DNA sequence: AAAGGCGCAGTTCGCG
DNA sequence: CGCGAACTGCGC
């Protein structure tokens, strides 16, 4: 099984290293014959000689073109003749490419920023993570001594805990009386002993939770203090820091540093992403949190250090359990995209698509379009019309069916051959013309993307049948990830088309997909209303909620199925409208905001405050109580009584702090903000103390009593203590609970005033 | 357990 | 006072 690739340089020459695990053994293969290259489009072919005469400097050495060869390629399906320029070292390319592009004979240049190790994987058609090779893993976590306002890395590391399938242990330099604690003499001997543990176990994967940003950087700081070479690599190297957009990520050579944080952050939508929250969210079991104050407290005085030890052990253990569960999904996705799990696990869907397309472009001899420069990126600034959203008919309705398309957008892309190479092609025999926006798509040949996207859907269908046929639970689980990875990739082509930084960016294509999607859904609604007697209550993009106002549960069900059998022949083959489910009651508040209840009492909520992290738990739970009363039974007057005792509790300061926390994400550097709402106001104070604030950070704040501008009376949720603070009962009644329950109860004639306690 | 796409409902706060 | 830009997070 291929894990990863890199290169090193021997005597000036690049040597690819392929890191593999074969038959229980880690292997390194070397490739010294691989030549870096990019392509040049010339005016005259006779100009190639002056292009080879071009030179540049790399650390004082003169870099030149090693050799060039004229090649025949396709560019967006059209024939193109370019010169492949070979170099001795991949580092020659950045050094020399600008001066070559500048040359008066060079129309343009291509494929000059594909990193050498990634290029190797693509050109050699190698796929990482193939096979059944079992990989050993090791999780680890550290615990640091922290005090208010301190610089990063100055305080020592108190604990390093680790875990694999067999055990979870803790290394520390004070005496703690627990079976799983290992006591050594100093911080240095603790870090040294951890190194020894890792080298001993020799894990293929190192799992951390936010290790990319904290654990490796802090171990780095400490190791430089204590004079310790931090050797974690299988080749005996220190962990390598790589840049990833604004963020940092950490490699460990010969191993896979699987940082769970960016994976979970992409995968699951949660209010907070603390290790405790994630574990609770994934495994259902709760995990107790010990704060850096309590930790610091205990260390100064050997007090409650068994609780801190337990905490540290649990960090590593829990980190290992989540690692084991998220890894396989990430490996299938890596196998699909054809890039290392290290890269893939830290990539957006858009980046995954691009790596997929770069590899497919190589297979089919399609020259890749470049990433857009600053200028072109400005011409990609305009937006376009998206999904259709129907203004709902507000209120409570009985006996609702939800009908929808599955994979609307990729079906459209395949059906109509939507593709930047099929867009606006002259002299074709057959065209598909997008509604409203009017773009023509040639149908005489499968386009680059639709071809790839059609292969995906077939392969997925093959895997689903294997999955359903198999009696082997392990194979079933594996195929399930495989088919889930294909879906994600299939679903990302659309977004990619309209993503301004894409090589295969195409606004006209993304517009056409959305215009078709509107045509189809609006047609389905029109037929359902006119042909059958249904009242369409609401619709969004690819699906709709409907019912027949007089009808009982059985009539609506029958009539819905019968409408599908009527409507589906009238849609293109790939576009199948499906019956998703039946709901005894539903309540639609506004666009994007509704909630339904099914026959088994289960309630589904969409868009309402209940599902948002920037609404306090008291406003959300209460809004839930109100919805439950109105959905489960028909009792409005119950919901009002619910709101009565909640606002009454709040006004008398009896609701715990836990239910008052509001969560809001920082989305940019704090300097770039131009309007300072409470979450920025809190974040700015934190940063003033010495707390690292990065885009993506979630601020948890509570609103204390005392009035005026909200951001002033807001404090971080952790620093709230009832012995010192009184919360703003007025804010949580008037700005949280009452507005949240008003959305619903205003539909029944209740205003904010008759729901309060006082006045 | 889709979303670097777009369509929306909504809160904060300074503004005249 | 009402208004509107700034800003967040949702549904697809
Ligand atoms: O989409 C949110 C994350 C889903 N997800 C995964 C979830 C694994 C869950 C395991 C749960 C579990 N429970 C709780 C069941 C609650 O409905 C439980 C209770 C009693 C005994 C055993 C268990 C186990 C531990 C089975 C995984 C599969 C990790 C995954 C991978 C990739 C993306 C999302 C998810
Ligand atoms: Cl280009």
Residue by residue, DSSP assigns A102-134 as HSTTEEEEES--S-HHHHHHHHTT--BT-S---
Of A131, A137, A136, which Cα lies nearest the Cα of A1? A131
Task: Look at residue A212 and give its three-state secondary structure.
Answer: helix
The C-alpha angle A36, A41, A42, rounded to 5 degrees, equals: 120
Instruction: Tell me how far the alpha carbon of residue A618 is from its chain's centroid.
Output: 28
- For residue A706, what are its two tokens? 């005392």
A487 beta carbon < 7 A from strand B? yes
Q: In this structure, are residues A639 and A630 in contact, taking their beta carbons and an 8 Å threshold?
A: yes
Q: Which of residues 506-545 of A touch strand B (CB under 7 A)?
A: 510, 514, 541
How many C-beta atoms surround the C-beta of residue A35 within 10 A? 15
Same domain? For A528 and A574 the reply is yes
Last residue of a domain, one of A527, A562, A585: A585
The 8-class DSSP code of residue A655 comes to: S
Choice from A284, A331, A334, A481 to test ligand 1 binding pocket (greatest atom count within 8 A of CB)? A284
Name the residues contacting strand C (CB < 7 Å). A 269, 271, 386-387, 540-543, 592, 605-607, 611-614, 663-668, 672-675, 677, 679-680, 698
In this complex, the answer to whether residue A492 has its CB under 7 A from any atom of chain B, a nucleic strand, is yes
Nearest-angstrom CA–CA distance, A169 and A56? 54
Verify that A9 and A86 share a domain, yes or no: yes
**Cα distance from N-terminal residue to C-terminal residue, chain A:** 70
- CB burial of residue A400 (10 Å; 0-12, 13-18, 19+): buried
CA of A347 to C1' of B3 (A): 13
Phi, psi of A637 (to 5 degrees): -60, -25
Verify that A619 and A523 share a domain, yes or no.
Answer: no
Question: What Å resolution does this PDB entry report?
Answer: 2.3
- Cβ within 8 Å of residue A483, ≥6 positions away: A460, A463, A464, A467
- Say if residues A395 and A402 touch (Cβ distance below 8 Å): no
Angle A73-A421-A72 (CA atoms, 0-180°, nearest 5)? 5
How many other C-beta atoms lie within 10 A of the C-beta of residue A383?
8
Instruction: Supply the angle between the helices A738-745 and A636-651 in degrees, to the nearest 10.
Output: 170
By the 8 A CB rule, do A545 and A522 touch?
Answer: no
Q: Which residue has the tokens 């680059």?
A: A448
Please tell me the distance from the alpha carbon of residue A575 to that of residue A589, in angstroms, as a whole number. 29
C-alpha to C-alpha distance for A537 and A487, rounded to whole angstroms: 29
**Which position has the token pair 């990482």?**
A128
CATH code at position A49: 3.30.342.10
User: Ligand 1 centre from A532 Cα, in Å?
Assistant: 41
Here the tokens at position A562 are 């019968």
A136 touches strand B (CB under 7 A): no
CA-based nearest residue to A110, from A423, A366, A448: A366
CA torsion sign for A358, A360, A362, A365 is negative
Give the atom of ligand 1 at the shortest distance from the alpha carbon of A329: 32
Phi, psi of A81 (to 5 degrees): -115, 110
* Structure-token pair, residue A353: 């698509």
- Token readout for A398 is 């009985």
Burial of A238 (0-12, 13-18, 19+ CB in 10 A): middle
**Same domain, yes or no: A276 and A321:** yes
d(CA A477, CA A471): 11
The answer on A362 and A343 residing in a single domain is no
How far, in Å, CA of A725 to CA of A715, rounded? 10
Contact present, A538 and A545 (Cβ < 8 Å): yes
Residue A504 tokens, joined: 């295969």
The number of beta carbons lying within 10 Å of the beta carbon of residue A669 is 12
Spell out where A607-733 has E strands.
Answer: 662-665, 698-703, 714-716
DSSP state of A705: S
Numbers of helices and strands, H then E, in chain A: 23, 29
Q: Note whether A358 and A385 are same-domain residues.
A: no
Those nucleotides of strand B lying less than 7 Å from any protein Cβ are 1-14
To test the pocket of ligand 1, the residue of A278, A279, A282 to mutate (highest count of ligand atoms within 8 Å of its CB) is A282
Peptide bond preceding A759 in cis form (omega within 30 of 0):
yes
Radius of gyration of chain A (CA): 30
A142, two tokens: 């550290």
Number of domains in chain A: 5
How many angstroms separate the alpha carbon of residue A278 from the centre of ligand 1?
11
Last residue in a domain, options A347, A380, A395: A347
A234, A272: one domain: yes
A176-190: b (≥16 Cβ within 10 Å) or e: beeebbbebeebbeb
Please check whether strand B approaches the CB of A348 to within 7 Å.
yes
| Local structure of A9: helix, strand or coil | strand
Same domain, A108 and A32: yes
C1' (B9) to CA (A231) span, angstroms:
52
Is strand B in 7 Å reach of the CB of A470?
Answer: no
Domain of A92, in residue numbers: 1-130+348-368
d(CA A442, CA A56): 44
Residue A228: which CATH number? Answer: 3.30.420.10
List residues bridging with A82 in a β-sheet.
A71
What are the CA-CA distances from residue A58 to residues A14, A15, A64, A94, A744 (Å)?
A: 15, 18, 10, 10, 67
Strand pairing partners for A141?
A161
A441 and A388, same domain (yes or no)? yes
Question: What distance in angstroms lies between residue A283's CA and the mean position of ligand 1's atoms?
Answer: 5
Strands A55-58 and A714-716: unpaired
Are the beta carbons of A703 and A713 closer than 8 angstroms?
yes
If asked whether residues A556 and A412 sit together in one domain, one would say yes
Among all chains, which residue has been given the structure tokens 């205990």? Answer: A298
- H-type helices in A531-598, by residue range? 553-567
Beta-carbon count within 10 A of A518 CB: 18
Whether the Cβ atoms of residue A228 and residue A192 lie closer than 8 Å to each other: yes
Name which of A12, A19, A38 is nearest A96 in CA terms: A38
Place of tokens 């294909």: A486
Tell me which H or E stretch contains A440.
Answer: strand A440-442
Distances from the Cα of A757 to the Cαs of A264, A309, A649, A704, A706, in angstroms? Answer: 42, 47, 9, 20, 20
Three-state DSSP state, A41: strand
Q: Give the residue from A156, A488, A160, A191 showing the smallest Cα distance to A319.
A: A160
Q: Are residues A466 and A517 in the same domain?
A: no
- Find which nucleotide's C1' atom is closest to A677's CA: B12
Phi/psi at A594 (nearest 5 deg)?
-160, 175
Judge if A380 and A435 occupy the same domain: yes
Sequence-separated contacts (24+) of A386-389 with Cβ below 8 Å: A386/A514, A387/A514, A387/A517, A387/A518, A387/A540, A387/A541, A387/A542, A388/A517, A388/A518, A388/A521, A388/A522, A388/A539, A388/A540, A388/A541, A389/A539, A389/A540, A389/A541, A389/A591, A389/A592
Q: Is the dihedral of CA A149, A155, A158, A162 positive or negative?
A: positive
The rounded Å distance from CA A110 to ligand 2 centre is 7
């Amino acid at each position: 099984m291929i894990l990863d690739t890199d290169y090193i340089t021997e005597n000036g020459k690049p040597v690819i290293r392929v890191f593999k695990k074969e038959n229980g053994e880690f292997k390194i293969e070397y490739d010294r014959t691989f030549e870096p290259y990019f392509y040049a489009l010339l005016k005259d072919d006779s100009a190639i000689e002056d292009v080879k005469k071009v030179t540049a400097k790399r650390h004082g050495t003169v870099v030149k073109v090693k050799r060039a060869e004229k090649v025949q390629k396709k560019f967006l399906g059209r024939p193109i003749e370019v010169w492949k320029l070979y170099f001795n070292h991949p580092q020659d390319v950045p050094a020399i490419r600008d001066r070559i592009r500048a040359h008066p004979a060079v129309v343009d240049i291509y494929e000059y920023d594909i990193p050498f190790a990634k290029r190797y994987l693509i050109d050699k058609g190698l796929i990482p993570m193939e096979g059944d090779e079992e990989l050993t893993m090791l999780a680890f976590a550290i615990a640091t001594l922290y005090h208010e306002g301190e610089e990063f890395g100055t305080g020592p590391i108190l604990m390093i805990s680790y875990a694999d399938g067999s055990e979870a242990r803790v290394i520390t330099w004070k005496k703690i009386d627990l079976p799983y604690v290992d006591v050594v003499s100093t911080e240095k001997e603790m870090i040294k002993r951890f190194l020894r543990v890792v080298r001993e176990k020799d894990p293929d994967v190192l799992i951390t939770y936010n290790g990319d940003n904290f654990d490796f950087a802090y171990l780095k700081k400490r190791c430089e203090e204590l004079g310790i070479k931090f050797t974690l690599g299988r080749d005996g190297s220190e962990p390598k820091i790589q840049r990833m957009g604004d963020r940092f990520a950490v490699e460990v050579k010969g191993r896979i540093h699987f940082d769970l944080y960016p994976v979970i952050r992409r995968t699951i939508n949660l209010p907070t992403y603390t290790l405790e929250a994630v574990y609770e969210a994934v495994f259902g079991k709760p995990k107790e949190k010990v704060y850096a104050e309590e930790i610091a407290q205990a260390w100064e005085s050997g007090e409650g250090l068994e609780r801190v030890a337990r905490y540290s052990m649990e960090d590593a253990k829990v980190t290992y359990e989540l690692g084991r569960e998220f890894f396989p999904m990430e490996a299938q996705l890596s196998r699909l995209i054809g890039q290392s799990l290290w890269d893939v696990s830290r990539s957006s869907t858009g980046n995954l698509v691009e790596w997929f397309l770069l590899r497919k472009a190589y297979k089919r001899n399609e020259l890749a379009p470049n990433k857009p420069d600053e200028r072109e990126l400005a011409r990609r600034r305009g937006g376009y019309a998206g999904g259709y959203v129907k203004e709902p008919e507000r209120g409570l309705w009985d006996n609702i069916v939800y009908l929808d398309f599955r994979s609307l957008y990729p079906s459209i892309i395949i059906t109509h051959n939507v593709s930047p190479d099929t867009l606006n092609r002259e002299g074709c025999k057959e065209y598909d013309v997008a509604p409203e926006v009017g773009h023509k798509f040639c149908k005489d040949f499968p386009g680059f993307i639709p071809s790839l996207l059609g292969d995906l859907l077939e392969e997925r269908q093959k895997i689903k049948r294997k999955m359903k046929a198999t009696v082997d639970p392990l194979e079933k689980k594996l195929l399930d990830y495989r088919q889930r990875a294909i879906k994600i990739l299939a679903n990302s082509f659309y977004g990619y088309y309209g993503y301004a930084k894409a090589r295969w960016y195409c606004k006209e294509c993304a517009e056409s997909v959305t215009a078709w999607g509107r045509e189809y859904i609006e047609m389905v609604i029109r037929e359902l209303e006119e042909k059958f007697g249904f009242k369409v209550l609401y619709a969004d993009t690819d699906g709709l909620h409907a019912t027949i106002p007089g009808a009982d549960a059985e009539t609506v069900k029958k009539k819905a199925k019968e409408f599908l059998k009527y409507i589906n022949p009238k849609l293109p083959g790939l576009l199948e409208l499906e019956y998703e489910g039946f709901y005894v009651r539903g309540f639609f508040v506004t666009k994007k905001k509704y909630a339904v209840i099914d026959e088994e009492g289960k309630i589904t909520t969409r868009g309402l405050e209940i599902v948002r992290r920037d609404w306090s738990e008291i406003a959300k739970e209460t809004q839930a109580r109100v919805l439950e009363a109105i959905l489960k039974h028909g009792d409005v007057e119950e919901a009002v009584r619910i709101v009565k005792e909640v606002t009454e509790k709040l006004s008398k300061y009896e609701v715990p702090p836990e239910k008052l926390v509001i969560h809001e994400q920082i989305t940019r550097d704090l300097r770039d903000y131009k309007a300072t709402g409470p979450h920025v106001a809190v974040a700015k104070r934190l940063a003033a103390r010495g707390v690292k604030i990065r885009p993506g950070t979630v601020i948890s704040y509570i609103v204390l009593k005392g009035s005026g501008r909200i951001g002033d009376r807001a404090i971080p949720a952790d620093e709230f203590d009832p012995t010192k603070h009184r919360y703003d009962a007025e804010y949580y009644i008037e700005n949280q609970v009452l507005p949240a329950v008003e959305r619903i109860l205003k539909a029944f004639g209740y205003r904010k005033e008759d729901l309060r306690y006082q006045k």
